[PDB]
Design a protein around this ligand. Structure first.
Ligand SMILES: [K+]
Ligand SMILES: [K+]
Ligand SMILES: [K+]
Ligand SMILES: [K+]
Ligand SMILES: [K+]
Ligand SMILES: [K+]
Ligand SMILES: [K+]
Ligand SMILES: [K+]
Ligand SMILES: [K+]
Ligand SMILES: [K+]
Ligand SMILES: [K+]
Ligand SMILES: [K+]
Ligand SMILES: [K+]
Ligand SMILES: [K+]
Ligand SMILES: [Mg+2]
Ligand SMILES: [Mg+2]
Length: 1323
DNA sequence: CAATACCGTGTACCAGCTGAGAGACTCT
DNA sequence: CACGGTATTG
């Protein structure tokens, strides 16, 4: 009675099967609980659990942060009102009340219905004088008269509620008054250097050309046009691009060897400009200085479109400009339409359903939708030239609250705010005392490194307080410890040392950590010369010498440098051979050289006394990102260096963390030697033990202290903390649960083996392509504009990624010829089963790669390596892709053997984690030598094994027929894996978790590893094999080709498979989010307790968490007589907590009385019901049902559908043609299933007519569409499908009355344990 | 209760920690 | 996207 378990782990399924030593699936009687006739049932021990995908926490996180945003914005308004409270009471005692109740209707209003002034005359007068809030903003900024306190509040509140972004550091002081003079000064500074070839700025309207509502690039072309004998890629062209906020590269301008890309907005611009000036000289400094100057004057030309010399509120003035032009253009457009085409006027100005001005202002039409609607109308009319000009600049009839206002920095709003405060503090003293308070309310932002301002009731918070008092925008620095919080922000997330768990790992760029990495690589290098008999380790003295002379003088150390600069220069070796490193050393002393460039003091860095200091500095540069805190923490070392060095140190920041702690690296000492790990790396006699040898050596103390430092998660917690998609972690947890239930099913006997197999955006594509094209300087999107959806075509995506060129040949590709080109695998897919862009390429003909058995040929490499490097720099291909392309100049036979091995050997980390979990759960006992006793072998397989087995022995799978293929996959996994390790017991080292003992031959072996199943094999030449296959040594039978294939065939043909759909309470959003207009419908849900939706509108479409069976009574008629009822009441997500708090009260409040409490059945989604003739239904909600049966199509028809549909060989085609009649029979099957179970008369008859319509079609296509027909019978929700060209729309089960009298089936996870409840016996 | 058709919150920026893949060193 | 909510037509 021994058995094995097969598992197929996916993101929506866990297939499971139990097999004996004869590869048979057992069957058992299982008890059946409940109140029905049936006391037990026969079950095959095979099946599959289905479940809805697990979801990421991301959407939840976005919702949470937006909630915190709304809370804090409301609090901003509340702070402001609190400052205004006393004096507004003197001016208008119900102003803020009218504001808070502005949403209410006039019935529900407690005050007068005009919010600002409280009477109609003054309200109309206000709106006449101030059509938009920006009119009032500009008036309050510019005017000197005392103003109404309510208008002052409204202006400041508008600025504080919509305050703009915080993406620009420092203060901004708009001034565009002398852009022309700054541009002329730039031209003068340039012409100073180049007296031989100056630029004549006379007549160049830089103010207009550069501030035009055009792209930065567009304006570059125009301006260069104004400068004769000057070209856009010359030096002045690049300086103009610089002033415009572009990223020009001055490499060609100065004949540099390295790139000199420069961007003014980048926070690294100062050091980059110093880099460049070190290359070219400080005589050019002024040049870039001048650039900066001009750049400060035109920085915001796009949002500030008004002369800043007339008003101190140029943003509101630009909004007023939008408004005035909207008015003028609307007047003109109305007149033009009235004149030239009156019949359209209504449509344009009255029909909200159309995308006219009506839909633009009152309907749901957007500015883009509106422009698209009205542009043909404009082009048809005459007199619309300037209107079309504004239309094609996205600047016609603009609103003032638009999508593009995200550009506006908070400094602009703050400027207008401070201006209003300065104006009106002359008249209201409280505005003078609270000016900085209001400014702070606008400017204050919770720092990212502080997080929620919690008090011990937030699982997301880490902030610590200096004092226990309420935090406000004004006492934040005093109440909150910014430093401790910034530290905890990073430290709550960083690893501890796996060897010393109570120690934090070092920063990745710590000097100590890089010394460690270097010496660790160095201590395993070996060398020989002529006179040497055998390879020798480097001594301690030799390694110190190499670090000093090579690693501390070059950022990277190449093997050639090691050979010449050391062995020749120091040891006088004319020739030497090196091992332990190839080409160059992986490790390096990057931080050493950075700090050298900064402090310019080699002796300081090399002095060991300073070790700690440097560590701390790097820690501070890694831990903190706020330059002020960096300064605060580094101040204690400001005495050791001068001002300029501290200035450079601040701008020097690092990210990233290592794997080891300082205590492990250079702290713990071996008791006898008294040496740290780094000491042994520096010098260890002639043993040269490295880190792994050092921590595992029993003749040293290190291993003991590691064990002393070592130190209880649950299964759920352990699985949650794995790295992987939540969708697959769900499947992993369900897998472990399934294995537990199966073990219990076998009387708590553990299996011999467990075989596990695990199965294997348009905006990102658009972003990649935009970035690559703008990095390329290409106009390919100008000439061939593309939308993100279109990029889902593989060949077009590859076209855009390749700059429209063949990759194996330096020739342009043609878009319209994409169908004629080839997509080739760089490494051939017979070796590396990689089908991603990283291994694929668009070429005219794949023949041009060279030979199809290897990497693209050397000739192609020689041709194209420069273009490939250009694509790599633009990040249009990856380094992996470039390396695979260029490998011919560097596939050995070892590579191909390894590629096959990896085709068959699972090495994914996540599958290894599933294997670890199962292996640790099964094998818990240790033997007399304290070794683990591996009772259960956990085998892991890739899908190709069972896939090839299916395709070889005609056990074909068609996913669309039903869900059985998951269970069948589990069974085949078990069979193949157990047979495999039975045949070749050595292969355990590769397939069993935890098992380990450490080219043409291994290639042959691993390619033909599965031949032992076959009777005859064609390698190549024909090989014949015996009928009974046995173990090499034991002689145990492993495969009988005369019986075991029949066994697999009978198992795959079993009609009773335990497909279980995991019942799940629904969670998440309460309902659809659309805030719908008011309506008469009880289906409307109030958005606030007192906002009756009949007056105010609200949400509809709530999601049901789970339904509830109620047996009770309802009042009927005017008399209110009671009437016994049994019905399904869906409990929505919003009602759930209330219903669970006290269910009888909830139900009585719903209109049910005398509810039978013990007969209340909670029915989660997908709950299973059986009716008549075995027809099964699943709960989709309280009012809808899903198909609940599986169509067990006979195996012969499955294989027919596979081969006939081309899902080659002559025997297969003759079988397809000989068994053509099968088509009819298949339909018959479907029909007889539907009439019994699906119950969709109209859809079924439409399908039958469609099949009888296309009988004369090729058998291949009729099969390809019979595949689509199974959507009619598929388990789950009804869905639309298409037969050839006809469309069958889903038939929905829109009533749940029938299941109230049917049989409810409570299933365990495997579905073996059932509890059946006859619901007709209730009521 | 049909059959049927419609509908469904979206975008943008900034600061991090983590593992994993891939294909080559060194090792337990 | 998909599939459950809703209103409409009957
Ligand atoms: K019973
Ligand atoms: K966010
Ligand atoms: K009223
Ligand atoms: K020119
Ligand atoms: K609109
Ligand atoms: K015309
Ligand atoms: K609006
Ligand atoms: K290397
Ligand atoms: K940092
Ligand atoms: K292994
Ligand atoms: K729950
Ligand atoms: K959930
Ligand atoms: K969900
Ligand atoms: K269940
Ligand atoms: Mg709220
Ligand atoms: Mg709004």
């Amino acid at each position: 009675k021994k058995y094995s378990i097969g598992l197929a782990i996916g993101t929506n399924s866990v297939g499971w099967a139990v097999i004996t030593d004869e590869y048979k699936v057992p069957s058992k009687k299982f008890k059946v609980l409940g109140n029905t006739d049936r006391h037990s049932i026969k079950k095959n021990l095979i099946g599959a659990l289905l479940f809805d995908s697990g979801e990421t926490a991301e959407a939840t996180r976005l919702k949470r942060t937006a909630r915190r945003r709304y809370t804090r914005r409301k609090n901003r308004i509340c702070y402001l009102q609190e400052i205004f409270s006393n004096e507004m009471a003197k001016v208008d005692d119900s102003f803020f009340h009218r504001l808070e109740e502005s949403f209410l209707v006039e019935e529900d209003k407690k005050h007068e219905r005009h919010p600002i002034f409280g009477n109609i005359v003054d309200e109309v007068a206000y709106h006449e004088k101030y059509p938009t809030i920006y009119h009032l903003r500009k008036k309050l900024v510019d005017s000197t008269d005392k103003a109404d306190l309510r208008l002052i509040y409204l202006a400041l509140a508008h600025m504080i509620k919509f305050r703009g972004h915080f993406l620009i550091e420092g203060d901004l002081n708009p001034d565009n008054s002398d852009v022309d003079k700054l541009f002329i000064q730039l031209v003068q500074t340039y012409n100073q250097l180049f007296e031989e070839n100056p630029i004549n700025a006379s007549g160049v309207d830089a103010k207009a050309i550069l501030s035009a509502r055009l792209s930065k690039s567009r304006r570059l072309e125009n301006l260069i046009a104004q400068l004769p004998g000057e070209k856009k890629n010359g030096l002045f062209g690049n300086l103009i691009a610089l002033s415009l906020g572009l990223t020009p590269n001055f490499k060609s301008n100065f004949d540099l060897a390295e790139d000199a890309k420069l961007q003014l907005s980048k926070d690294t611009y100062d050091d980059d400009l110093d880099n460049l000036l070190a290359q070219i000289g400080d005589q050019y400094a002024d040049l870039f200085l001048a650039a900066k100057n001009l750049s400060d004057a035109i920085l915001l030309s796009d949002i500030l479109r008004v002369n800043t010399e007339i008003t101190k509120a140029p943003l509101s003035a630009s909004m007023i400009k939008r408004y005035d032009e909207h008015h003028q253009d609307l007047t003109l457009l109305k007149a033009l339409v009235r004149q030239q085409l009156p019949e359209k006027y209504k449509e344009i100005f009255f029909d909200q359903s159309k995308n006219g001005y009506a839909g633009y202002i009152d309907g749901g039409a957007s500015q883009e939708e509106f422009y698209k609607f009205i542009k043909p109308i404009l082009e048809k009319m005459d007199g619309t030239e300037e209107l079309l000009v504004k239309l094609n600049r996205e600047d016609l009839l603009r609103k003032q609250r638009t999508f593009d206002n995200g550009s506006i920095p908070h400094q602009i709003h703050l400027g207008e705010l401070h201006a209003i405060l300065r104006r009106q503090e002359d008249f209201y003293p409280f505005l003078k005392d609270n000016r900085e308070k209001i400014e702070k309310i606008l400017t204050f932002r919770i720092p990212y490194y502080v997080g929620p301002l919690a008090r011990g009731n937030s699982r997301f918070a880490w902030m610590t307080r200096k004092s226990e008092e309420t935090i406000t925008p004004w006492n934040f620095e005093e109440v909150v410890d910014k430093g401790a919080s910034a530290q905890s922000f990073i430290e709550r997330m960083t690893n501890f040392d796996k060897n010393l768990p109570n120690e934090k790992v070092l920063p990745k760029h710590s000097l100590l950590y890089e010394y460690f990495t270097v010496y660790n690589e160095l201590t395993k290098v070996k060398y020989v010369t002529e006179g040497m008999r055998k390879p020798a380790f480097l001594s301690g003295e030799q390694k110190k010498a190499i670090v000093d002379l090579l690693f501390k003088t070059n950022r990277k150390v190449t093997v050639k440098q090691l050979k010449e600069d050391y062995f020749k220069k120091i040891e006088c070796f004319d020739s030497v051979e090196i091992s332990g490193v190839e080409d160059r050393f992986n490790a390096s002393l990057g931080t050493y050289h950075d700090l050298l460039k900064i402090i310019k003091d080699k002796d300081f860095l090399d002095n060991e006394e300073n070790e700690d200091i440097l560590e701390d500095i790097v820690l501070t540069l890694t831990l903190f990102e706020d330059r002020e805190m960096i300064e605060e923490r580094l101040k204690t070392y400001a005495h050791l260096f001068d001002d300029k060095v501290m200035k450079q140190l601040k701008r020097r920041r690092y990210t990233g963390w290592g794997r080891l702690s300082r205590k492990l690296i250079n702290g713990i000492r071996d008791k006898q030697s008294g040496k740290t790990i780094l000491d042994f790396l520096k010098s260890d006699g002639f043993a040269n033990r490295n880190f792994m040898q050092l921590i595992h050596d029993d003749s040293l103390t290190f291993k003991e202290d590691i064990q002393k430092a070592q130190v209880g998660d649950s299964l759920h917690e352990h699985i949650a903390n794995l790295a992987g998609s939540p969708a697959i972690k769900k499947g992993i947890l369900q897998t472990v649960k399934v294995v537990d239930e199966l073990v219990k099913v076998m009387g708590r006997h553990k299996p011999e083996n467990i075989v596990i197999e695990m199965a294997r955006n348009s905006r990102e594509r658009m972003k990649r392509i935009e970035e690559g094209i703008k990095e390329l300087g290409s106009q390919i999107l100008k000439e061939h504009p593309v939308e993100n959806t279109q990029l889902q075509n593989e060949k077009l995506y590859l076209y855009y990624l390749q700059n429209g060129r063949d990759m194996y040949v330096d020739q342009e590709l043609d878009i319209n010829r994409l169908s004629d080109y080839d997509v080739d695998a760089i490494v051939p897919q017979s070796f590396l089963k990689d089908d991603s862009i990283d291994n694929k390429v668009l070429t005219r003909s794949d023949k041009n790669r060279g030979k199809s058995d290897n990497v693209p040929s050397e000739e192609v490499v020689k041709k194209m390596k420069n273009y490939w490097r250009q694509l790599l720099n633009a990040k249009l291909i990856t380094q992996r892709k470039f390396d695979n392309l260029t490998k011919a100049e560097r596939l050995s036979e070892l590579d191909k053997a390894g590629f096959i091995k990896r085709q068959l050997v699972e090495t994914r980390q996540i599958t290894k984690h599933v294997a670890q979990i199962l292996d640790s759960r099964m094998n818990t006992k240790y033997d007399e030598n304290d070794k683990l006793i591996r009772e259960v072998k956990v085998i892991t397989l890739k899908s190709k094994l069972v896939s090839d087995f299916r395709k070889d022995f005609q056990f074909y799978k068609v996913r669309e027929i039903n869900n059985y293929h998951h269970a069948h996959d589990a069974y085949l996994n078990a069979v193949v894996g157990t047979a495999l390790i039975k045949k070749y017991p050595k292969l355990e080292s590769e397939f069993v978790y935890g098992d380990y003992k450490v080219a043409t031959a291994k290639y042959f072996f691993y390619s033909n590893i599965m031949n032992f199943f076959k009777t005859e094999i064609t390698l190549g030449e024909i090989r014949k094999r015996p009928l009974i296959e046995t173990n090499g040594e034991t002689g145990e039978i492993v495969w009988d080709k005369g019986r075991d294939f029949a066994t697999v065939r009978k198992v795959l043909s079993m009609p009773q498979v335990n497909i279980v759909k995991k019942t799940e309470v629904q969670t998440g959003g309460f309902s659809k989010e659309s805030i719908l207009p008011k309506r008469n419908s009880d289906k409307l849900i109030a958005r606030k307790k007192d906002w009756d939706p009949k007056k105010y509108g609200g949400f509809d479409s709530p999601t049901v968490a789970y339904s509830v069976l109620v047996v009770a009574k309802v009042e009927k008629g005017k008399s209110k007589k009671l009437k016994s009822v049994k019905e399904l009441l869906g409990i929505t997500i919003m009602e759930r907590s209330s219903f669970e708090k006290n269910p009888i009260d909830f139900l009585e409040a719903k209109g049910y009385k005398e509810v039978k409490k013990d007969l209340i059945i909670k029915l989660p989604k997908y709950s299973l019901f059986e009716l008549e003739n075995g027809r099964k239904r699943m709960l989709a909600s309280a009012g809808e049902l899903q198909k609940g049966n599986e169509l067990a199509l006979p195996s012969k028809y499955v294989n027919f559908l596979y081969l006939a549909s081309h899902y080659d060989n002559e025997q297969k085609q003759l079988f397809v043609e000989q068994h053509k009649h099968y088509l009819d029979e298949i339909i018959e099957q479907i029909s007889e299933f539907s009439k019994r179970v699906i119950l969709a008369d109209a859809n079924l008859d439409k399908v039958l007519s469609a099949y009888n319509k296309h009988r004369d079609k090729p058998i291949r296509e009729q099969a390809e569409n019979i595949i689509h027909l199974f959507t009619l019978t598929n388990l789950g929700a009804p869905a639309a499908f298409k037969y050839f060209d006809t469309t069958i729309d889903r038939k929905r089960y829109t009533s749940t009355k029938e299941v109230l009298d049917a049989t409810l089936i409570h299933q365990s996870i495997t579905g073996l344990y059932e509890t059946r409840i006859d619901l007709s016996q209730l009521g």
